[PDB]
Write a protein that binds this ligand. Structure first.
Ligand SMILES: Nc1nc2c(ncn2[C@@H]2O[C@H](COP(=O)(O)O)[C@@H](O)[C@H]2O)c(=O)[nH]1
Ligand SMILES: *C(=O)[C@H](CCSC)NC=O
Ligand SMILES: [Mg+2]
Ligand SMILES: [Mg+2]
Ligand SMILES: [Mg+2]
Ligand SMILES: [Mg+2]
Ligand SMILES: [Mg+2]
Ligand SMILES: [Mg+2]
Ligand SMILES: [Mg+2]
Ligand SMILES: [Mg+2]
Ligand SMILES: [Mg+2]
Ligand SMILES: [Mg+2]
Ligand SMILES: [Mg+2]
Ligand SMILES: [Mg+2]
Ligand SMILES: [Mg+2]
Ligand SMILES: [Mg+2]
Ligand SMILES: [Mg+2]
Ligand SMILES: [Mg+2]
Ligand SMILES: [Mg+2]
Ligand SMILES: [Mg+2]
Ligand SMILES: [Mg+2]
Ligand SMILES: [Mg+2]
Ligand SMILES: [Mg+2]
Ligand SMILES: [Mg+2]
Ligand SMILES: [Mg+2]
Ligand SMILES: [Mg+2]
Ligand SMILES: [Mg+2]
Ligand SMILES: [Mg+2]
Ligand SMILES: [Mg+2]
Ligand SMILES: [Mg+2]
Ligand SMILES: [Mg+2]
Ligand SMILES: [Mg+2]
Ligand SMILES: [Mg+2]
Ligand SMILES: [Mg+2]
Ligand SMILES: [Mg+2]
Ligand SMILES: [Mg+2]
Ligand SMILES: [Mg+2]
Ligand SMILES: [Mg+2]
Ligand SMILES: [Mg+2]
Ligand SMILES: [Mg+2]
Ligand SMILES: [Mg+2]
Ligand SMILES: [Mg+2]
Ligand SMILES: [Mg+2]
Ligand SMILES: [Mg+2]
Ligand SMILES: [Mg+2]
Ligand SMILES: [Mg+2]
Ligand SMILES: [Mg+2]
Ligand SMILES: [Mg+2]
Ligand SMILES: [Mg+2]
Ligand SMILES: [Mg+2]
Ligand SMILES: [Mg+2]
Ligand SMILES: [Mg+2]
Ligand SMILES: [Mg+2]
Ligand SMILES: [Mg+2]
Ligand SMILES: [Mg+2]
Ligand SMILES: [Mg+2]
Ligand SMILES: [Mg+2]
Ligand SMILES: [Mg+2]
Ligand SMILES: [Mg+2]
Ligand SMILES: [Mg+2]
Ligand SMILES: [Mg+2]
Ligand SMILES: [Mg+2]
Ligand SMILES: [Mg+2]
Ligand SMILES: [Mg+2]
Ligand SMILES: [Mg+2]
Ligand SMILES: [Mg+2]
Ligand SMILES: [Mg+2]
Ligand SMILES: [Mg+2]
Ligand SMILES: [Mg+2]
Ligand SMILES: [Mg+2]
Ligand SMILES: [Mg+2]
Ligand SMILES: [Mg+2]
Ligand SMILES: [Mg+2]
Ligand SMILES: [Mg+2]
Ligand SMILES: [Mg+2]
Ligand SMILES: [Mg+2]
Ligand SMILES: [Mg+2]
Ligand SMILES: [Mg+2]
Ligand SMILES: [Mg+2]
Ligand SMILES: [Mg+2]
Ligand SMILES: [Mg+2]
Ligand SMILES: [Mg+2]
Ligand SMILES: [Mg+2]
Ligand SMILES: [Mg+2]
Ligand SMILES: [Mg+2]
Ligand SMILES: [Mg+2]
Ligand SMILES: [Mg+2]
Ligand SMILES: [Mg+2]
Ligand SMILES: [Mg+2]
Ligand SMILES: [Mg+2]
Ligand SMILES: [Mg+2]
Ligand SMILES: [Mg+2]
Ligand SMILES: [Mg+2]
Ligand SMILES: [Mg+2]
Ligand SMILES: [Mg+2]
Ligand SMILES: [Mg+2]
Ligand SMILES: [Mg+2]
Ligand SMILES: [Mg+2]
Ligand SMILES: [Mg+2]
Ligand SMILES: [Mg+2]
Ligand SMILES: [Mg+2]
Ligand SMILES: [Mg+2]
Ligand SMILES: [Mg+2]
Ligand SMILES: [Mg+2]
Ligand SMILES: [Mg+2]
Ligand SMILES: [Mg+2]
Ligand SMILES: [Mg+2]
Ligand SMILES: [Mg+2]
Ligand SMILES: [Mg+2]
Ligand SMILES: [Mg+2]
Ligand SMILES: [Mg+2]
Ligand SMILES: [Mg+2]
Ligand SMILES: [Mg+2]
Ligand SMILES: [Mg+2]
Ligand SMILES: [Mg+2]
Ligand SMILES: [Mg+2]
Ligand SMILES: [Mg+2]
Ligand SMILES: [Mg+2]
Ligand SMILES: [Mg+2]
Ligand SMILES: [Mg+2]
Lengths: 95, 240, 122, 159, 46, 147
RNA sequence: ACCAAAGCUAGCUCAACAUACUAAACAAAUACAAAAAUACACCAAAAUAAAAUAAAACAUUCACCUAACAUUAAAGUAUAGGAGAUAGAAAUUUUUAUCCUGACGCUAUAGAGAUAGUACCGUAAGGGAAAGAUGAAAGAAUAAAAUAAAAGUAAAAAAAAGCAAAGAUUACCCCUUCUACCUUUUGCAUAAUGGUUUAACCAGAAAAAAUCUAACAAAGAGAACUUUAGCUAGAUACCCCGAAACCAGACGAGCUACCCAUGAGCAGUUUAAAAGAACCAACUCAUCUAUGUGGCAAAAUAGUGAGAAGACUUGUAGGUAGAGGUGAAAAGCCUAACGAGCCUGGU
RNA sequence: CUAGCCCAAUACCGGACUAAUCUAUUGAAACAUAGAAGCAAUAAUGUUAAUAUGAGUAACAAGAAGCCUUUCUCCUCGCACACGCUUACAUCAGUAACUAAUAAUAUACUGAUAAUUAACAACCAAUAAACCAAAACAACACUAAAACGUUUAUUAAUUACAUUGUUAACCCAACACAGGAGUGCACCAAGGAAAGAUUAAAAGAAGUAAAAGGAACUCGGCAAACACAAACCCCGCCUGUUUACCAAAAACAUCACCUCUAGCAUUACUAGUAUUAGAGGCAAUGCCUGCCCAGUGACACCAGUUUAACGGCCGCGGUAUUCUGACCGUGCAAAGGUAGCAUAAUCACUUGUUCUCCAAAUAAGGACUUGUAUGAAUGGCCACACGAGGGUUUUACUGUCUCUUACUUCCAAUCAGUGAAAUUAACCUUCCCGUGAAGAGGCGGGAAUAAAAAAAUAAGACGAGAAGACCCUAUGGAGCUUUAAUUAACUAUUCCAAAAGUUAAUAACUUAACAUGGACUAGCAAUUUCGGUU
């Protein structure tokens, strides 16, 4: 991670995390299961469904991705016909 | 710094000129040829290799010169001979039996009858018999005897076809040239030059040969008895 | 090591290094190796006659000085040529093409002591 | 002068490469200057000449930034000066041929005040300006004589 | 054998190797003189 | 003779801007404490009989204003020459226009003196931020009700 | 009581403005071997930056890296990437004239290296210092006053026993008790490291997310953004020294390796011999031993040895320069450290 | 129990205070509230400066007397020039201190004043022609073929005195350094002084002499000696060269013999031309160099040829009573190690066995010899001469030794002057046993114990010196080699395109010098790397 750039002096972001991850506005990160396209003839339908299912990240990985991304990717996006707009918020979280 | 050559002498002279040796160093100063340097001080005796060279252009006919002395030359392995004709003398490469007080002929005339080949005589290849031993042969008419000069070495005339003479060099290679190329008859002096025995490692230093390197090098594929066929005949005639 | 700050004179070199000390040349080298000195190259000191010269190296202390008036080209012209040219123009014979009568020199290469090339040392 | 990837693969080695043009020693004839120059030209030069339909046409049309040749700029300057001066030394025995040659290049006629400054570099231009402005210092005698004449004329007219 | 005396003085070699003319006859020696002038050396050459 | 390990590095600019409402509230608090501590005096037109600074000195000593006095006028060019010449020779008596009022100077000077137009101007300038919008563009640009 | 200690100045540093930018001196001599008045010429040259580093390796890649477009945003966005490390725009937006310029910069181990690029060290490129303190008056030195405070000594050497001290004691020791300190370790009195001592210098630095405090609050921010209590401001944080190395450009063959010119030496004896013969001087090498080992010497002395008309020693001058030169190959020598010189820069 | 301020600590984490500076406001016998930092040193073989220990220790010097610079006692590198240093040279004066490693005073410090005078040396003609015939007492010759010159013709300002180097005790080595230094003269007619003054301990260095023995010492006869001789092997033919600074050799080179590569011109080779010139191997000479092109190279662009090219030259079993195997069976190879020598400088077994040498030998020499790992130009066998090469004998000789001793000089000790170095946490710095980070002056249990010098010996302080060079680790290097992985530039091939062109009624064909783009085969080479547990 480049904490201080050379041109603008700003903090940069890694593009791998934005290529293979998705941040919901509530702080959660969404990802794909590793190996969901490799050797599908060798795996059971239940395992294939487990691989095709999306998954969340835990607190340490989420904080790592927040450190590796800038503030532009932590904004509120109002997309037209966004499937994850219902998941952008959190409800009934009694902490 | 770049050095200048010692060969800055345009006027031909019979007196020996001093020459500056250089051991393998090019004009830059770096070694180009290894094993050269530190010989005996030598002078240079300018040799006239264009044998048929008349004094004045008014009489371009054949001419006869007289041998004054056959002397030793440290620059080449052969012996030199001073020949005088008219108002000038010149150094030539003496033949095997050329002694003081001989007459040498220099001719450029070719006739239907072959001439009797003596030793000091120099006729074009088209006028010599078919089995004549020759030396100081030429490549082009008037170019100069670049070929056979070494002591004892001599080539042989093989045949003359279509006004072109074929000779055979000491390397057993055939050389085709025009028949108007002048050539001296006989063998070059000092026929016993190959039989000389360097008595010690100091005679090589006298001659100016530095010792070989001490690095041991393993032989490669180049080594071994390569029985290669004789290369084709080297022709110098320009066929249009 | 050797010294670099000291001056490089003729005393500090080999026998083949003989550099002059600043004197001017007085001739050339002849035939048999000797030096031929030319009498035209040696400076001829032109000394005047100081017999009846009533002037001393010092002046009277009570003698007054003068205000500094450095002599200029305009002042010299006004002193040597302005009266002559003025009289000539008043008489009506002024010739702008010929100015040699007033002291002007067209080309310096004619006379002995020229001013721009400075042929004379002193 | 640049770099290249061997085997045309990015992940392979990077190697410095110098691409050079194919030079040719050709003889080109000019109509305005009437001389055959043995010049080292390229196939692109010959193609530009054939496209401009003439050596002089190509020289007069392609500017300095497209010529990139001091010799080409000198040729252009020479032919421009010749066109601006109407040089009779082109064909002293053929005035009709000279006029016919000068007519077909009428589109590039530049006056003399600018025809002698096109094929010059900065150093050459400064040298030319110095040679033009090189004037010997006039003696102060002349200036003082002029001043005195002015004062005398003033005193003569004020009476 | 014994070292330390590697400097044998000779004015000809000195002035021919590190002289003013030797420095000025090459573009690199001119750069040497320019560097010494920029530093302000009292002696630019031998 | 070596370098410094960390040391000071180049010209350092200690620059930051407090929020505008925070600065306005600071001005308000300065005025309020100056009034509540009996150290604020309202005058009229800031007129003086003479240009004698000793006159102002004796007047402040008689009125028990204190050692330091800051007189705030409405405008700069509208200042009377009498008070101008009286304050140009004094140190503890400082004359400032209305746009030059600041918390630092108000705390430095023991007594504050305000004219009636200056009081009106300060009130109008300070009360505007209590019911204003956030600047869409800088207030130097044309707004609907703002100059 | 000596040694000593303390000054406040010389001057520097960072910016602003600015004429618009190679200061002054240039009588003569100065690119002959610089400072040498004076003879028929030659003069000039360009061809990409590399690597040290990061990718915890290293092969594609690795911002700045001696090339102008500045500022507010877009935006660290699109994009480019062993799609890894990292790199990174643009379209489009904002920027009101002059003075108000000095210092919460240093005070002689600091601030420029500087009293100076000078002494000095190197053949050269190059490296590069330290050193000042009275007073109004020293044209007031039978000269006057403040500290007499570091380590080191003197005044004044020591008396059984012991990490040197503490508990104490009428009493210095005598009695009793405690295995120096940092660092590194499972564990050090450890006989594991470091330090004679004194003085002066010498080593934690960044605000993404967070906590605290405060302003305003569905809105906050003095323009561009963030917002389902949020927005703005402030305060809280991340050292020093050290390689062998790598690359680029200069400077080095006055030592040494080898060559090119130009010179010089070899006396006596045996030999038809100047025979790469023999004995042995000058001379040149350095076999063995003993001294020396911070020495006379960063390679020497003494004795003893080998060659000694030659492939011999040696003077002067020139050439070959490091991705190289040279080498009767010892991976030798190339200015006292050469499996590849030294200096500068990258750093 | 009596009072309280009411419970230990390494890495990391949290908090409250706070020394000294600067700034904004207080204060004015030196402070308070805030804001800032070049904000705090018992520790980096830390940097600079000064001080101690070692230590007044190591080390350093001037021949004698005298009437004071005159005579005696000794050793003999002196004079000049070239190169180099620049005044250090000369006269007078002073030296408390600075230079002499100490004084006296002075060529070496200080100040003033003077000096090196050209005949010697430096700078000191070109353009053409006649000119082959060495220097070495040069008469005349040898081979390695050899620097050094006149004359003739055309122009060479023409006229005293030009300019420059002239000292020295000196240069290069940090030094007033036992070192390094070219040339011509002589070996003294010129240069100098080994001892500052005493005593005569040890140990150390140098020398001389030594009864009887004469290598018995020792790895070795190293060193020394009244000796300074004769032989035998190994390795190199020989002279010679090499790791400046631990190896001079058996290493390299070498004459000779063999291989390859080249038919040719204006800067090497070469002003040469195959009896020549380069790239190499091995080593004079003598006898020889046996078989193999299977693999890898090189020519041949495929076959095919090449080993004095890189390199290789065999198993298993039985056989002539009892030991071997002339012989045979079978199998693989490209050939299956030939001649020679052989326990060697040749893996181990090995101190192989045997004879000579000695009283005794793992030493030396001669023989036997599969050396299953010798071997024939990466050369094999003998031989002359040679070698500071490595071993072995015979006398001679001797302090090497049995077995040391005596005396001198330098050292040494005292006196006088001057005066360093590594080292050092602080020491008020014993022995034994035990314990303990596993070897104690410091701990435990006991013994010993007035305090300080001076001279000796080195058992310990795991003594000093050099951030172990051996070993390992590092995703640290560098040199070298390639059958490591990616492949540049350059040099040699070849091909295509480009360019120039030529033939015929769209086709075929050639490239002197350069020379551009893209491919191919090789040299020269470039970048990088060498998984981990053990
Ligand atoms: N890893 C670890 N090291 C410890 C711990 N306690 C002490 N140490 C280590 O032990 C050493 C100090 O020993 P202590 O002071 O604990 O006796 C240090 O190296 C310290 O880091 C622990 O709990 N964990
Ligand atoms: C071996 O024990 C070692 C020898 C190293 S020399 C190559 N000695 C000391 O470390
Ligand atoms: Mg020859
Ligand atoms: Mg000959
Ligand atoms: Mg050979
Ligand atoms: Mg060899
Ligand atoms: Mg110097
Ligand atoms: Mg001289
Ligand atoms: Mg001299
Ligand atoms: Mg004269
Ligand atoms: Mg030196
Ligand atoms: Mg500093
Ligand atoms: Mg890396
Ligand atoms: Mg790292
Ligand atoms: Mg590595
Ligand atoms: Mg690395
Ligand atoms: Mg880079
Ligand atoms: Mg891609
Ligand atoms: Mg990776
Ligand atoms: Mg300073
Ligand atoms: Mg300094
Ligand atoms: Mg004290
Ligand atoms: Mg006690
Ligand atoms: Mg341990
Ligand atoms: Mg221990
Ligand atoms: Mg310790
Ligand atoms: Mg350790
Ligand atoms: Mg430590
Ligand atoms: Mg220590
Ligand atoms: Mg933040
Ligand atoms: Mg690299
Ligand atoms: Mg030399
Ligand atoms: Mg002799
Ligand atoms: Mg001899
Ligand atoms: Mg000796
Ligand atoms: Mg002896
Ligand atoms: Mg001797
Ligand atoms: Mg001898
Ligand atoms: Mg001998
Ligand atoms: Mg040289
Ligand atoms: Mg390399
Ligand atoms: Mg090399
Ligand atoms: Mg070797
Ligand atoms: Mg080796
Ligand atoms: Mg060196
Ligand atoms: Mg308790
Ligand atoms: Mg606790
Ligand atoms: Mg404070
Ligand atoms: Mg600090
Ligand atoms: Mg301290
Ligand atoms: Mg140490
Ligand atoms: Mg120490
Ligand atoms: Mg310290
Ligand atoms: Mg002392
Ligand atoms: Mg003493
Ligand atoms: Mg002692
Ligand atoms: Mg002593
Ligand atoms: Mg000197
Ligand atoms: Mg003294
Ligand atoms: Mg003196
Ligand atoms: Mg003299
Ligand atoms: Mg004595
Ligand atoms: Mg003496
Ligand atoms: Mg003495
Ligand atoms: Mg003794
Ligand atoms: Mg003795
Ligand atoms: Mg004796
Ligand atoms: Mg005896
Ligand atoms: Mg014995
Ligand atoms: Mg014994
Ligand atoms: Mg001996
Ligand atoms: Mg003997
Ligand atoms: Mg004997
Ligand atoms: Mg030998
Ligand atoms: Mg022989
Ligand atoms: Mg040699
Ligand atoms: Mg050695
Ligand atoms: Mg040697
Ligand atoms: Mg030796
Ligand atoms: Mg030897
Ligand atoms: Mg050999
Ligand atoms: Mg033979
Ligand atoms: Mg061999
Ligand atoms: Mg042989
Ligand atoms: Mg064979
Ligand atoms: Mg084959
Ligand atoms: Mg085959
Ligand atoms: Mg035998
Ligand atoms: Mg064996
Ligand atoms: Mg024995
Ligand atoms: Mg074998
Ligand atoms: Mg063998
Ligand atoms: Mg072989
Ligand atoms: Mg021998
Ligand atoms: Mg020898
Ligand atoms: Mg030997
Ligand atoms: Mg005795
Ligand atoms: Mg004690
Ligand atoms: Mg313990
Ligand atoms: Mg331990
Ligand atoms: Mg014990
Ligand atoms: Mg005890
Ligand atoms: Mg005890
Ligand atoms: Mg007991
Ligand atoms: Mg001891
Ligand atoms: Mg001792
Ligand atoms: Mg101890
Ligand atoms: Mg020990
Ligand atoms: Mg030790
Ligand atoms: Mg270590
Ligand atoms: Mg070691
Ligand atoms: Mg090792
Ligand atoms: Mg690792
Ligand atoms: Mg690396
Ligand atoms: Mg490969
Ligand atoms: Mg790379
Ligand atoms: Mg490598
Ligand atoms: Mg490994
Ligand atoms: Mg391992
Ligand atoms: Mg193991």
């Amino acid at each position: 991670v480049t904490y201080f750039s050379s041109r603008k002096g700003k903090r940069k972001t890694v593009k791998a995390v934005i290529y293979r991850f998705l941040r919901l506005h509530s702080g959660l990160w969404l990802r794909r299961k590793a190996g969901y396209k490799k050797k599908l003839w060798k795996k059971t339908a239940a395992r294939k469904r487990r691989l095709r299912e999306f998954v969340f990240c835990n607190k340490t990985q989420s904080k790592l991705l927040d450190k590796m991304t800038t503030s532009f990717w932590k904004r509120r996006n109002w997309y037209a016909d966004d499937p994850y707009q219902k998941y952008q918020d959190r409800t009934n979280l009694k902490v | 710094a770049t050095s200048v050559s010692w060969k800055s002498r345009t006027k031909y002279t019979v007196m020996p000129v001093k020459m500056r040796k250089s051991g393998g160093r090019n004009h830059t100063g770096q070694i180009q040829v290894h094993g050269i340097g530190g010989g005996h001080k030598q002078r240079y005796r300018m040799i006239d290799f264009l044998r048929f060279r008349p004094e004045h252009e008014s009489k371009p006919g054949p001419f006869e010169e007289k041998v004054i002395a056959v002397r030793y030359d440290p620059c080449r392995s052969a012996d030199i001979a001073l020949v005088a004709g008219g108002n000038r003398k010149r150094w030539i490469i003496a033949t095997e039996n050329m002694k003081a007080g001989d007459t040498v002929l220099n001719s450029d005339h070719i006739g239907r009858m072959a001439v009797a080949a003596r030793e000091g005589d120099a006729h074009p290849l088209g006028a010599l018999p078919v089995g004549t031993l020759i030396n100081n042969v030429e490549s082009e008419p008037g170019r100069g005897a670049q070929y056979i000069r070494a002591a004892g070495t001599c080539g042989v005339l093989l045949r003359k076809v279509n006004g072109t003479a074929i000779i055979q060099l000491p390397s057993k290679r055939q050389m085709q040239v025009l028949e108007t190329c002048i050539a001296t008859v006989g063998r070059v002096s000092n026929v016993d030059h190959n039989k000389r025995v360097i008595g010690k490692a100091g005679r090589n230093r006298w001659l100016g040969k530095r010792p070989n390197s001490g690095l041991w090098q393993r032989k490669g594929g180049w080594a071994g008895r390569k029985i290669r066929p004789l290369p084709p005949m080297k022709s110098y005639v320009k066929l249009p | 090591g050797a010294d670099r700050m000291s001056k490089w004179t003729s005393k500090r070199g080999p026998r083949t290094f003989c550099k002059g000390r600043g004197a001017k040349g007085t001739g050339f080298h002849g035939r048999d190796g000797k030096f031929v000195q030319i009498k035209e190259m040696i400076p001829e000191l032109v000394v005047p006659e100081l017999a009846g010269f009533k002037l001393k190296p010092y002046v009277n202390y009570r003698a007054p000085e003068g205000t500094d008036t450095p002599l200029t080209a305009k002042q010299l012209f006004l002193e040597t040529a302005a009266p002559a040219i003025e009289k000539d123009f008043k008489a009506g014979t002024f010739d702008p093409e010929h100015l040699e009568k007033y002291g002007f020199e067209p080309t310096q290469e004619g006379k002995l002591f020229q001013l721009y090339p400075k042929n004379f040392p002193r | 002068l640049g770099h290249r990837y061997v085997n045309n693969d990015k992940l392979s080695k990077r190697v410095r490469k110098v691409w050079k043009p194919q030079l040719f020693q050709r003889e080109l004839y000019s109509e305005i200057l009437d001389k055959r120059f043995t010049v080292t030209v390229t196939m692109r030069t010959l193609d530009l000449i054939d496209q401009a339909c003439g050596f002089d046409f190509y020289i007069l049309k392609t500017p300095k930034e497209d010529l990139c040749s001091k010799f080409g700029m000198d040729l252009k300057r020479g032919m421009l000066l010749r066109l601006a001066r109407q040089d009779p030394q082109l064909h002293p025995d053929d005035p009709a041929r000279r006029a016919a040659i000068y007519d077909r290049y009428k589109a590039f006629v530049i006056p003399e005040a600018e025809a002698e400054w096109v094929g010059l570099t900065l150093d050459e231009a400064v040298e030319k300006q110095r040679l033009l402005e090189e004037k010997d210092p006039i003696p102060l005698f002349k200036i003082f004589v002029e001043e005195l004449l002015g004062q005398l004329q003033q005193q003569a007219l004020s009476e | 054998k014994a070292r330390g005396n590697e400097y044998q003085p000779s004015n000809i070699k000195r002035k021919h190797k590190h002289g003013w003319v030797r420095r000025l006859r090459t573009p690199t020696g001119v750069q040497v003189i320019l560097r010494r002038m920029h530093k302000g050396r009292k002696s630019l050459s031998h | 003779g070596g370098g410094v390990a960390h040391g000071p590095r180049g010209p350092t600019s200690y620059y930051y801007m407090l929020p505008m409402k925070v600065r306005v509230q600071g001005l308000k608090v300065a005025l309020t404490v100056k009034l509540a501590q009996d150290d604020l005096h309202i005058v009229d037109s800031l007129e003086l009989p003479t240009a004698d600074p000793q006159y102002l000195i004796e007047l402040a000593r008689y009125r028990r204003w204190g050692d330091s006095v800051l007189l705030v006028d409405l405008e700069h060019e509208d200042m009377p020459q009498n008070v101008v010449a009286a304050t140009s020779g004094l140190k503890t008596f400082n004359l400032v226009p209305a746009v030059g009022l600041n918390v630092h100077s108000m705390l430095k000077h023991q007594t504050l003196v305000l004219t009636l137009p200056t009081v009106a101007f300060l009130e109008e300038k300070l009360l505007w931020h209590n019911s204003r919008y956030t600047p869409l563009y800088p207030f130097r640009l044309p707004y609907c009700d703002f100059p």
